[PDB]
Amino acid sequence: GSSGSSGMSSVSEVNVDIKDFLMSINLEQYLLHFHESGFTTVKDCAAINDSLLQKIGISPTGHRRRILKQLQIILSKMQDIPIYASGPSSG
């Protein structure tokens, strides 16, 4: 076995309410689903997968993909690293 990923420390910071994550794509219709399931923020959706989406109730798939897609972009961002962006320069 190999363990490593396990480490990311959750925090209200750099985080958004599941509601906002859905309203951003107009999928707030799954608010009661995520809430009841036990998902308040997007982060909590770190252990979520299409399988779970279609499980919670999500009948239509076309929506599932749209939900996960964003989650991937968001979650990926969720980081506790400083801002580092430089312009055109060699040395």
Considering the domain delimited by 1-91, tell me its CATH architecture: Orthogonal Bundle (1.10)
Q: How far apart are CA 45 and CA 61, in angstroms?
A: 17
Beta bridge partners of 17: 41
Selection from 24, 30, 74, 29 nearest residue 52 by Cα: 30
Q: How far apart are CA 49 and CA 68, in angstroms?
A: 7
The answer to whether 25 touches 19, Cβ cutoff 8 Å, is no
For the chain, the structural domain boundaries read 1-91
